[PDB]
Design a protein around this ligand. Structure first.
Ligand SMILES: Nc1nccc2c(S(=O)(=O)N3CCCNCC3)cccc12
Lengths: 19, 346
């Protein structure tokens, strides 16, 4: 499921800005 | 969405007075309105690339505040001088129910300090990740507050440029307070700076075009999607893969998204600027009059008269239970002034 793919991803914590 | 009737004229009049008040403060900013030993430092509430946000207690009143601390030398190394001057000049000038209130600012030899109202309910991010996703009525309630906040900011020629659940705090009434104006900018033209957060970047930022306030409306689409799905519309472990998805022009929706929600998001997550809601002839009213918002009483939201989805738990004044724990670092103030000329106007 896309949910499950998200939860196993490295992007579920707080996301830093870029610049 | 095109109709200009009595309600639209009232909005116009409100925004005209709001701009007169903003410009007075924009042209004559407050400076040096407290000092560090006016506060007892309690606990770190969050961190960022320039320093930390700390819970503090103001000694003379006993009020609690959130104190953002920026190391001037780190700001310079990250080439964020002008952005940090923007942040403070804008935050001290704005006034809107869903924007955090800056109460004091000052600087010392080492650091910049912005002391804001403490918003005890924690980040939307925390609640959203824990519960998984919000119902459409609850996502709508939060989205309506962002729509009004962007209507206000954009009318002042401000672009916000970092919408995400991490930057939205939940207050004791269950309403939103936007924080982190680190990328906010007052601009009448287009602008060009590569900034924001990967999942929320509009295609035109990624592609190094000039861009305008339409990037905030794209980011609203990302936020509504993430609130209602539990995950953002474009994600991958490597940012370049996120960017490839953003610019592709493709988006997929969960099976449970209503037909109205998908229609709104197709119009916000529109790669073509000439088609993106918020950027058309009717401006924000294409969004405010969309079917997905038909139940939204925009004035009742502004007045905070709408029952919130939830009230954050509150154990007492100065409680931080709705925030994560962070490693504490001692605040060091050098005996030599650092970067004084760069930050003279702060
Ligand atoms: N007024 C405030 N009251 C509580 C918390 C506040 C925070 S914060 O630590 O929650 N913060 C830090 C990490 C970067 N993302 C924004 C969230 C930031 C700014 C103002 C706050």
């Amino acid at each position: 499921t896309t949910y499950a793919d998200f939860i196993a991803s490295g992007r579920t914590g707080r996301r830093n800005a870029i610049h | 969405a095109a109709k200009k009737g009595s309600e639209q004229e009232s909005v116009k009049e409100f925004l005209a007075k709001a701009k007169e008040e903003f410009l007075k403060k924009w042209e004559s900013p407050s400076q040096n309105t407290a000092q560090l030993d006016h506060f007892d430092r309690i606990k770190t509430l969050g961190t960022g690339s320039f320093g930390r946000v700390m819970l503090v207690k103001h000694k003379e009143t006993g009020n609690h505040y959130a104190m953002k601390i920026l190391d001037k030398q780190k700001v310079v190394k990250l080439k964020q001088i002008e952005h940090t001057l923007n942040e403070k000049r804008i935050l001290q000038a704005v006034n809107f129910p869903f924007l955090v209130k800056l109460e004091f600012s000052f600087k010392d030899n080492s650091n910049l300090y912005m002391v804001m109202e403490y918003v005890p309910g924690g980040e939307m991010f925390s609640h959203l990740r824990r519960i998984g996703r919000f119902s459409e009525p609850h996502a709508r309630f939060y989205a309506a507050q962002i729509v009004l906040t962007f209507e206000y900011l954009h009318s002042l020629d401000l672009i916000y440029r970092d919408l995400k659940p991490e930057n939205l705090l939940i207050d004791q009434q269950g309403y939103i307070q936007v924080t982190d104006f680190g990328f906010a900018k007052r601009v009448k033209g287009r602008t060009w700076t590569l900034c924001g957060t990967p999942e929320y970047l509009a295609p035109e930022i990624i592609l190094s075009k000039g861009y305008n306030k339409a990037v905030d409306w794209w980011a609203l689409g990302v936020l509504i999607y993430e609130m209602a799905a539990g995950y953002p519309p474009f994600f991958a472990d490597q940012p370049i893969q996120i960017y490839e998805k953003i610019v592709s022009g493709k988006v997929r929706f969960p099976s449970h998204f209503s037909s109205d929600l998908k229609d709104l998001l197709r119009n916000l997550l529109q790669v073509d600027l000439t088609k993106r809601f918020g950027n058309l002839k009717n401006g924000v009213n294409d969004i405010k009059n969309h079917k997905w918002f038909a139940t939204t009483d925009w004035i009742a939201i502004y007045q905070r008269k709408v029952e919130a989805p939830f009230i954050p738990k509150f154990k007492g004044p100065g409680d931080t239970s709705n925030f994560d724990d962070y490693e504490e670092e001692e605040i060091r103030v050098s005996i030599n002034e650092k970067c004084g000329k760069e930050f003279t106007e702060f």
